[PDB]
Protein backbone atom coordinates (compact mmCIF):
# COMPACT_ATOMS: atom_id res chain seq x y z
CA UNK A 1 0.00 0.00 0.00
CA UNK A 2 1.39 3.70 0.28
CA UNK A 3 0.85 6.02 3.27
CA UNK A 4 0.66 9.61 2.72
CA UNK A 5 1.96 12.81 5.14
CA UNK A 6 0.52 16.45 4.45
CA UNK A 7 2.37 19.68 5.24
CA UNK A 8 1.41 21.43 8.48
CA UNK A 9 -1.16 23.69 8.54
CA UNK A 10 -0.72 27.83 7.43
CA UNK A 11 -1.56 30.89 7.75
CA UNK A 12 -1.56 33.44 5.33
CA UNK A 13 -2.01 36.77 3.94
CA UNK A 14 -4.95 37.35 1.53
CA UNK A 15 -3.46 37.53 -1.66
CA UNK A 16 -0.59 35.59 -1.36
CA UNK A 17 0.13 32.08 -2.60
CA UNK A 18 0.93 28.73 -0.51
CA UNK A 19 2.15 25.22 -1.71
CA UNK A 20 1.03 22.25 0.72
CA UNK A 21 2.66 19.20 0.04
CA UNK A 22 1.64 15.01 0.24
CA UNK A 23 4.76 13.15 1.03
CA UNK A 24 4.60 9.53 -0.30
CA UNK A 25 6.28 6.22 0.95
CA UNK A 26 5.82 2.77 -0.29
CA UNK A 27 5.59 1.03 -3.34
CA UNK A 28 5.35 1.99 -6.72
CA UNK A 29 5.25 5.59 -5.97
CA UNK A 30 4.79 6.28 -9.76
CA UNK A 31 1.58 3.87 -10.33
CA UNK A 32 -0.90 6.04 -7.80
CA UNK A 33 -3.15 8.75 -9.17
CA UNK A 34 -2.22 11.73 -7.24
CA UNK A 35 -5.80 14.16 -6.35
CA UNK A 36 -6.53 16.32 -4.32
CA UNK A 37 -10.16 17.76 -2.09
CA UNK A 38 -11.10 20.72 -0.62
CA UNK A 39 -13.57 20.51 2.43
CA UNK A 40 -14.58 23.90 4.28
CA UNK A 41 -15.61 23.45 7.90
CA UNK A 42 -18.98 21.95 7.89
CA UNK A 43 -19.10 21.13 4.26
CA UNK A 44 -18.89 18.87 1.69
CA UNK A 45 -15.89 17.36 -0.13
CA UNK A 46 -14.88 19.14 -3.22
CA UNK A 47 -12.77 17.73 -5.66
CA UNK A 48 -9.85 20.15 -6.77
CA UNK A 49 -8.22 18.01 -9.40
CA UNK A 50 -5.65 15.25 -10.17
CA UNK A 51 -2.26 14.18 -11.29
CA UNK A 52 -1.23 11.34 -13.05
CA UNK A 53 2.81 11.11 -11.79
CA UNK A 54 3.36 8.40 -14.94
CA UNK A 55 2.34 10.48 -17.76
CA UNK A 56 2.13 13.55 -16.15
CA UNK A 57 -1.48 14.54 -17.32
CA UNK A 58 -3.21 16.78 -14.83
CA UNK A 59 -7.23 17.35 -14.62
CA UNK A 60 -8.66 20.29 -12.43
CA UNK A 61 -12.09 20.84 -11.10
CA UNK A 62 -13.31 24.07 -13.40
CA UNK A 63 -13.83 25.99 -10.32
CA UNK A 64 -9.94 26.15 -9.91
CA UNK A 65 -8.77 26.23 -12.78
CA UNK A 66 -7.42 29.71 -12.08
CA UNK A 67 -6.26 28.77 -8.53
CA UNK A 68 -4.70 25.70 -8.02
CA UNK A 69 -1.81 23.58 -9.96
CA UNK A 70 -0.64 20.09 -8.96
CA UNK A 71 2.98 18.84 -9.56
CA UNK A 72 4.85 15.80 -8.32
CA UNK A 73 8.30 15.73 -7.23
CA UNK A 74 9.42 12.14 -8.62
CA UNK A 75 12.90 12.35 -7.28
CA UNK A 76 11.64 12.82 -3.19
CA UNK A 77 7.89 10.97 -3.15
CA UNK A 78 6.15 14.27 -3.14
CA UNK A 79 2.88 15.83 -4.21
CA UNK A 80 2.14 19.58 -4.16
CA UNK A 81 -0.52 21.62 -4.76
CA UNK A 82 -0.18 25.27 -4.99
CA UNK A 83 -2.91 27.77 -4.35
CA UNK A 84 -3.24 31.50 -5.87
CA UNK A 85 -4.61 34.54 -4.72
CA UNK A 86 -5.48 33.50 -1.61
CA UNK A 87 -9.14 34.59 0.13
CA UNK A 88 -11.11 34.02 3.30
CA UNK A 89 -13.43 31.75 0.82
CA UNK A 90 -9.92 29.49 0.66
CA UNK A 91 -10.06 29.15 4.40
CA UNK A 92 -10.34 24.84 4.65
CA UNK A 93 -8.68 21.58 5.10
CA UNK A 94 -7.25 20.08 2.28
CA UNK A 95 -6.58 16.69 1.52
CA UNK A 96 -4.14 14.72 -0.66
CA UNK A 97 -4.85 11.03 -2.30
CA UNK A 98 -3.61 8.44 -4.32
CA UNK A 99 -4.92 5.76 -5.54
CA UNK A 100 -4.73 2.65 -8.22
CA UNK A 101 -6.55 -0.34 -8.76
CA UNK A 102 -5.21 -2.15 -5.45
CA UNK A 103 -5.46 0.56 -3.42
CA UNK A 104 -6.76 4.22 -1.82
CA UNK A 105 -4.86 6.53 0.38
CA UNK A 106 -5.62 9.88 2.55
CA UNK A 107 -3.44 11.93 3.82
CA UNK A 108 -4.45 13.24 7.24
CA UNK A 109 -5.56 16.83 6.19
CA UNK A 110 -4.07 20.74 5.85
CA UNK A 111 -5.71 23.58 7.91
CA UNK A 112 -5.42 26.71 5.82
CA UNK A 113 -6.21 30.05 7.18
CA UNK A 114 -6.57 33.44 5.02
CA UNK A 115 -6.70 35.87 7.33
CA UNK A 116 -5.01 39.70 8.07
CA UNK A 117 -4.95 38.82 11.96
CA UNK A 118 -1.52 37.88 13.55
CA UNK A 119 -0.86 34.80 15.40
CA UNK A 120 -1.37 34.51 19.31
CA UNK A 121 -0.44 31.52 21.61
CA UNK A 122 -3.16 30.44 24.10
CA UNK A 123 -3.08 30.69 27.53
CA UNK A 124 -3.45 27.01 29.12
CA UNK A 125 -5.52 27.43 32.92
CA UNK A 126 -5.63 24.01 34.67
CA UNK A 127 -9.41 22.81 35.73
CA UNK A 128 -9.22 21.27 39.27
CA UNK A 129 -12.44 20.15 41.02
CA UNK A 130 -17.84 15.59 46.83
CA UNK A 131 -15.99 12.04 46.87
CA UNK A 132 -17.58 10.34 44.22
CA UNK A 133 -16.89 7.08 42.39
CA UNK A 134 -15.46 9.48 39.51
CA UNK A 135 -13.71 12.79 39.25
CA UNK A 136 -13.97 15.19 36.16
CA UNK A 137 -10.67 17.33 35.44
CA UNK A 138 -10.62 20.43 32.79
CA UNK A 139 -8.26 22.06 30.83
CA UNK A 140 -8.95 25.85 29.41
CA UNK A 141 -6.93 26.78 26.36
CA UNK A 142 -7.64 30.48 25.60
CA UNK A 143 -6.98 33.31 22.84
CA UNK A 144 -5.21 31.88 20.50
CA UNK A 145 -4.75 32.20 16.59
CA UNK A 146 -5.26 30.59 14.09
CA UNK A 147 -6.55 26.81 14.54
CA UNK A 148 -5.80 24.45 15.01
CA UNK A 149 -4.73 23.35 18.41
CA UNK A 150 -3.76 19.62 20.39
CA UNK A 151 -5.06 19.10 23.37
CA UNK A 152 -3.64 15.42 25.01
CA UNK A 153 -4.45 14.07 28.32
CA UNK A 154 -0.99 12.33 30.10
CA UNK A 155 0.66 12.86 26.53
CA UNK A 156 -1.90 10.32 25.11
CA UNK A 157 -2.33 7.85 28.14
CA UNK A 158 -5.57 9.15 29.05
CA UNK A 159 -8.28 8.98 26.28
CA UNK A 160 -10.89 6.99 27.01
CA UNK A 161 -13.04 10.02 29.55
CA UNK A 162 -11.90 12.58 27.21
CA UNK A 163 -14.50 15.43 26.02
CA UNK A 164 -12.50 17.78 23.74
CA UNK A 165 -14.77 20.37 22.65
CA UNK A 166 -15.25 22.86 19.45
CA UNK A 167 -13.22 25.90 19.67
CA UNK A 168 -14.72 28.83 19.51
CA UNK A 169 -13.81 32.57 17.75
CA UNK A 170 -14.49 35.83 19.09
CA UNK A 171 -13.35 39.35 18.04
CA UNK A 172 -10.02 37.54 16.46
CA UNK A 173 -9.62 34.63 19.21
CA UNK A 174 -10.45 31.21 19.36
CA UNK A 175 -11.47 29.65 22.75
CA UNK A 176 -12.12 25.79 23.51
CA UNK A 177 -11.67 23.59 26.65
CA UNK A 178 -11.51 19.67 27.19
CA UNK A 179 -12.32 17.94 29.90
CA UNK A 180 -11.47 14.26 31.79
CA UNK A 181 -13.67 12.03 33.79
CA UNK A 182 -11.27 9.54 35.92
CA UNK A 183 -12.18 7.63 38.70
CA UNK A 184 -11.43 9.35 41.97
CA UNK A 185 -9.10 6.32 43.59
CA UNK A 186 -6.44 7.56 40.08
CA UNK A 187 -6.53 10.98 40.92
CA UNK A 188 -4.30 12.50 42.89
CA UNK A 189 -3.00 9.15 43.38
CA UNK A 190 -1.82 9.09 39.31
CA UNK A 191 -0.68 12.34 38.07
CA UNK A 192 -3.04 13.76 35.10
CA UNK A 193 -1.45 16.72 32.83
CA UNK A 194 -2.90 18.82 29.89
CA UNK A 195 -0.95 18.82 26.83
CA UNK A 196 -1.43 21.53 24.62
CA UNK A 197 -0.17 22.01 21.18
CA UNK A 198 -0.28 24.81 18.84
CA UNK A 199 1.91 24.55 15.85
CA UNK A 200 0.92 28.09 14.05
CA UNK A 201 2.70 29.70 17.11
CA UNK A 202 5.22 26.60 17.39
CA UNK A 203 4.32 25.99 21.28
CA UNK A 204 3.52 22.98 23.58
CA UNK A 205 2.70 23.77 26.92
CA UNK A 206 2.05 20.86 29.65
CA UNK A 207 0.20 21.54 32.84
CA UNK A 208 -0.11 19.49 35.41
CA UNK A 209 -3.81 19.25 37.45
CA UNK A 210 -3.23 20.34 40.80
CA UNK A 211 -6.37 20.46 43.46
CA UNK A 212 -6.64 23.54 45.12
CA UNK B 1 -21.21 17.39 -16.35
CA UNK B 2 -21.33 14.83 -13.80
CA UNK B 3 -23.74 15.82 -11.22
CA UNK B 4 -24.18 13.65 -7.79
CA UNK B 5 -27.67 13.61 -5.94
CA UNK B 6 -27.26 12.20 -2.54
CA UNK B 7 -30.53 11.49 0.01
CA UNK B 8 -31.48 12.12 2.63
CA UNK B 9 -29.32 14.60 3.54
CA UNK B 10 -29.65 13.64 7.29
CA UNK B 11 -30.43 10.02 8.53
CA UNK B 12 -31.74 8.98 12.12
CA UNK B 13 -31.31 5.70 12.93
CA UNK B 14 -31.45 3.28 15.85
CA UNK B 15 -28.78 1.28 16.99
CA UNK B 16 -29.08 -2.80 15.18
CA UNK B 17 -31.44 -1.39 12.35
CA UNK B 18 -30.49 -1.14 8.67
CA UNK B 19 -30.29 1.81 7.18
CA UNK B 20 -29.36 2.67 3.70
CA UNK B 21 -28.48 5.69 1.84
CA UNK B 22 -29.19 6.39 -1.88
CA UNK B 23 -27.27 8.84 -4.54
CA UNK B 24 -28.36 9.24 -8.13
CA UNK B 25 -26.19 9.95 -10.99
CA UNK B 26 -26.43 11.94 -13.94
CA UNK B 27 -23.79 10.07 -15.92
CA UNK B 28 -24.63 6.25 -16.03
CA UNK B 29 -22.52 3.95 -14.96
CA UNK B 30 -22.44 0.66 -17.39
CA UNK B 31 -20.98 -2.42 -16.05
CA UNK B 32 -18.01 -1.76 -17.80
CA UNK B 33 -17.77 1.77 -17.00
CA UNK B 34 -15.68 4.96 -18.12
CA UNK B 35 -16.72 5.52 -14.27
CA UNK B 36 -17.09 4.30 -11.22
CA UNK B 37 -18.61 4.78 -8.16
CA UNK B 38 -17.31 4.28 -4.16
CA UNK B 39 -18.81 5.31 -1.04
CA UNK B 40 -17.15 7.01 1.75
CA UNK B 41 -17.70 7.49 5.30
CA UNK B 42 -16.06 10.30 7.46
CA UNK B 43 -15.79 11.07 11.09
CA UNK B 44 -15.59 15.01 12.22
CA UNK B 45 -11.97 15.45 11.93
CA UNK B 46 -10.73 12.80 10.09
CA UNK B 47 -10.27 12.01 6.42
CA UNK B 48 -12.79 9.93 4.66
CA UNK B 49 -12.31 6.46 4.88
CA UNK B 50 -13.09 3.96 1.49
CA UNK B 51 -15.49 1.48 2.35
CA UNK B 52 -17.05 -2.39 1.47
CA UNK B 53 -13.74 -3.16 0.07
CA UNK B 54 -20.05 -11.09 5.69
CA UNK B 55 -19.39 -7.02 5.95
CA UNK B 56 -21.44 -4.58 7.58
CA UNK B 57 -21.67 -1.98 4.50
CA UNK B 58 -22.76 -3.50 1.41
CA UNK B 59 -23.57 -1.74 -1.95
CA UNK B 60 -25.87 -2.06 -4.28
CA UNK B 61 -27.14 -0.49 -7.77
CA UNK B 62 -26.08 0.10 -11.50
CA UNK B 63 -26.62 2.95 -13.65
CA UNK B 64 -27.61 6.02 -12.52
CA UNK B 65 -29.11 4.82 -8.46
CA UNK B 66 -26.69 3.48 -6.29
CA UNK B 67 -27.65 2.19 -2.57
CA UNK B 68 -25.12 2.18 0.87
CA UNK B 69 -27.34 -0.45 3.11
CA UNK B 70 -25.50 -0.34 6.96
CA UNK B 71 -26.60 -3.71 8.60
CA UNK B 72 -27.11 -3.81 11.32
CA UNK B 73 -26.18 -0.06 12.46
CA UNK B 74 -23.86 0.26 15.37
CA UNK B 75 -22.94 3.51 17.57
CA UNK B 76 -19.40 3.97 15.69
CA UNK B 77 -20.96 4.26 12.55
CA UNK B 78 -21.77 8.16 13.19
CA UNK B 79 -20.42 9.64 10.65
CA UNK B 80 -21.06 11.31 7.52
CA UNK B 81 -21.17 9.05 4.26
CA UNK B 82 -20.30 10.33 0.69
CA UNK B 83 -20.46 8.60 -2.45
CA UNK B 84 -18.27 9.16 -4.92
CA UNK B 85 -18.06 8.78 -8.55
CA UNK B 86 -14.77 8.18 -10.52
CA UNK B 87 -14.13 9.46 -14.34
CA UNK B 88 -11.41 10.55 -16.32
CA UNK B 89 -12.47 13.96 -16.75
CA UNK B 90 -13.49 14.46 -13.52
CA UNK B 91 -13.98 13.46 -9.88
CA UNK B 92 -16.70 14.05 -7.96
CA UNK B 93 -18.69 13.71 -4.47
CA UNK B 94 -22.04 13.74 -3.27
CA UNK B 95 -23.62 16.27 -0.47
CA UNK B 96 -23.30 13.84 2.23
CA UNK B 97 -25.31 12.30 4.22
CA UNK B 98 -24.95 12.72 7.88
CA UNK B 99 -26.12 9.39 10.12
CA UNK B 100 -27.42 10.15 13.63
CA UNK B 101 -28.03 7.77 16.28
CA UNK B 102 -31.37 7.41 17.93
CA UNK B 103 -30.42 6.22 21.79
CA UNK B 104 -32.45 6.70 24.97
CA UNK B 105 -32.95 10.00 27.02
CA UNK B 106 -29.77 10.94 28.81
CA UNK B 107 -29.06 13.41 31.52
CA UNK B 108 -26.20 15.84 31.87
CA UNK B 109 -23.13 14.72 33.97
CA UNK B 110 -22.47 18.39 34.92
CA UNK B 111 -19.11 19.70 36.21
CA UNK B 112 -18.63 23.74 37.83
CA UNK B 113 -14.82 25.15 38.21
CA UNK B 114 -13.60 27.85 39.07
CA UNK B 115 -11.18 30.55 37.59
CA UNK B 116 -7.76 29.21 38.25
CA UNK B 117 -5.10 31.02 40.32
CA UNK B 118 -3.22 31.66 36.87
CA UNK B 119 -5.93 33.65 35.42
CA UNK B 120 -6.59 35.35 38.43
CA UNK B 121 -3.44 36.45 37.71
CA UNK B 122 -3.59 37.47 34.22
CA UNK B 123 -6.99 39.61 35.44
CA UNK B 124 -9.58 37.81 33.84
CA UNK B 125 -12.16 35.04 35.33
CA UNK B 126 -13.60 32.41 33.33
CA UNK B 127 -15.99 29.73 35.11
CA UNK B 128 -16.46 26.47 33.13
CA UNK B 129 -18.92 23.95 33.22
CA UNK B 130 -19.50 20.96 31.40
CA UNK B 131 -22.65 18.93 30.64
CA UNK B 132 -21.06 15.61 29.79
CA UNK B 133 -22.78 12.32 28.17
CA UNK B 134 -26.23 13.50 27.78
CA UNK B 135 -29.10 12.60 25.47
CA UNK B 136 -30.89 14.37 23.04
CA UNK B 137 -28.53 16.79 21.08
CA UNK B 138 -30.68 19.85 22.22
CA UNK B 139 -30.39 21.36 25.72
CA UNK B 140 -30.87 24.93 26.80
CA UNK B 141 -28.54 25.96 30.00
CA UNK B 142 -28.61 29.36 32.16
CA UNK B 143 -27.13 30.44 35.16
CA UNK B 144 -27.40 32.91 37.88
CA UNK B 145 -24.66 34.54 39.73
CA UNK B 146 -25.43 34.79 43.28
CA UNK B 147 -29.32 33.96 42.18
CA UNK B 148 -28.95 36.85 39.31
CA UNK B 149 -29.03 35.66 35.79
CA UNK B 150 -26.36 36.16 33.54
CA UNK B 151 -26.65 36.60 29.82
CA UNK B 152 -23.67 38.15 29.29
CA UNK B 153 -20.17 36.43 28.47
CA UNK B 154 -21.27 32.72 27.59
CA UNK B 155 -19.52 30.46 25.69
CA UNK B 156 -21.26 27.57 24.32
CA UNK B 157 -19.83 24.29 22.28
CA UNK B 158 -21.37 20.96 21.80
CA UNK B 159 -19.48 18.29 20.61
CA UNK B 160 -20.27 15.61 17.96
CA UNK B 161 -22.34 12.61 18.86
CA UNK B 162 -19.93 10.21 20.84
CA UNK B 163 -18.71 6.95 19.22
CA UNK B 164 -19.05 4.88 22.08
CA UNK B 165 -22.57 5.86 23.73
CA UNK B 166 -24.45 8.00 21.03
CA UNK B 167 -24.66 11.13 23.85
CA UNK B 168 -23.55 14.39 23.48
CA UNK B 169 -21.85 16.95 25.47
CA UNK B 170 -21.40 20.78 25.87
CA UNK B 171 -19.30 22.92 27.18
CA UNK B 172 -20.28 26.32 28.45
CA UNK B 173 -18.09 29.06 30.03
CA UNK B 174 -18.99 32.25 31.48
CA UNK B 175 -15.78 35.01 31.12
CA UNK B 176 -16.13 38.02 33.20
CA UNK B 177 -12.73 40.31 33.88
CA UNK B 178 -10.91 40.01 37.40
CA UNK B 179 -12.53 42.81 38.88
CA UNK B 180 -16.33 42.05 38.14
CA UNK B 181 -15.62 38.20 39.59
CA UNK B 182 -14.57 39.41 43.12
CA UNK B 183 -17.86 40.85 43.70
CA UNK B 184 -20.10 37.89 44.16
CA UNK B 185 -19.52 34.96 45.58
CA UNK B 186 -22.58 32.32 44.69
CA UNK B 187 -22.13 30.81 41.17
CA UNK B 188 -24.69 27.82 39.80
CA UNK B 189 -24.65 26.06 36.42
CA UNK B 190 -28.15 25.04 35.78
CA UNK B 191 -29.30 22.10 32.78
CA UNK B 192 -32.93 21.24 31.65
CA UNK B 193 -34.12 18.12 30.67
CA UNK B 194 -39.81 15.13 36.34
CA UNK B 195 -38.43 18.23 34.53
CA UNK B 196 -35.24 18.05 37.31
CA UNK B 197 -33.90 21.07 36.64
CA UNK B 198 -29.52 20.09 37.37
CA UNK B 199 -27.66 22.50 39.00
CA UNK B 200 -24.00 22.51 40.15
CA UNK B 201 -23.36 25.29 42.34
CA UNK B 202 -19.37 26.60 43.92
CA UNK B 203 -19.23 29.58 46.74
CA UNK B 204 -16.53 32.18 47.22
C1 LIG C 1 -8.78 1.80 -5.03
O1 LIG C 1 -10.18 1.52 -5.13
C2 LIG C 1 -10.79 1.46 -6.35
C3 LIG C 1 -11.10 2.66 -7.01
N1 LIG C 1 -11.31 3.90 -6.34
C4 LIG C 1 -11.77 3.96 -4.95
C5 LIG C 1 -12.62 5.22 -4.83
N2 LIG C 1 -11.88 6.43 -5.25
C6 LIG C 1 -11.37 6.30 -6.63
C7 LIG C 1 -10.54 7.53 -6.99
C8 LIG C 1 -10.49 5.05 -6.75
C9 LIG C 1 -11.28 2.66 -8.41
F1 LIG C 1 -11.63 3.80 -9.04
C10 LIG C 1 -11.62 1.47 -9.01
C11 LIG C 1 -11.32 0.26 -8.40
C12 LIG C 1 -11.25 -0.96 -9.25
O2 LIG C 1 -11.26 -0.95 -10.49
C13 LIG C 1 -11.19 -2.22 -8.52
C14 LIG C 1 -11.33 -3.50 -9.22
O3 LIG C 1 -11.31 -4.54 -8.61
O4 LIG C 1 -11.50 -3.53 -10.55
C15 LIG C 1 -11.00 -2.16 -7.16
N3 LIG C 1 -10.87 -1.04 -6.45
C16 LIG C 1 -10.69 -1.29 -5.01
C17 LIG C 1 -11.61 -2.32 -4.35
C18 LIG C 1 -11.79 -0.84 -4.04
C19 LIG C 1 -10.94 0.23 -7.05
NA1 LIG D 1 1.68 33.40 -7.60
NA1 LIG E 1 -2.21 -4.69 -3.38
NA1 LIG F 1 -16.02 13.22 21.96
Known amino acids: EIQLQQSGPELVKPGTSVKVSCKAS????????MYWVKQSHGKSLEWIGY????????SYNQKFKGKATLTVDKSSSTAYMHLNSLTSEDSAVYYC?????????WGQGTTLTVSSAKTTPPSVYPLAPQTNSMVTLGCLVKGYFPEPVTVTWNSGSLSSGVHTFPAVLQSDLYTLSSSVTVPSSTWPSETVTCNVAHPASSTKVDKKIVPR | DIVLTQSPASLAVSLGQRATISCRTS??????????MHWYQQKPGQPPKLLIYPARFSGSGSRTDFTLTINPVEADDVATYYC?????????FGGGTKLEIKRADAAPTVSIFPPSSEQLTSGGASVVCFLNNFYPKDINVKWKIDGSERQNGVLNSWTDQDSKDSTYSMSSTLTLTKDEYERHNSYTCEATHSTSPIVKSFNR
Open chain 1, 26 to 33: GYALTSYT
Open chain 2, 84 to 92: QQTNEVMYT
Open chain 2, 27 to 36: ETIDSYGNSF
Open chain 1, 51 to 58: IDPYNGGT
Open chain 1, 97 to 105: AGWNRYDED
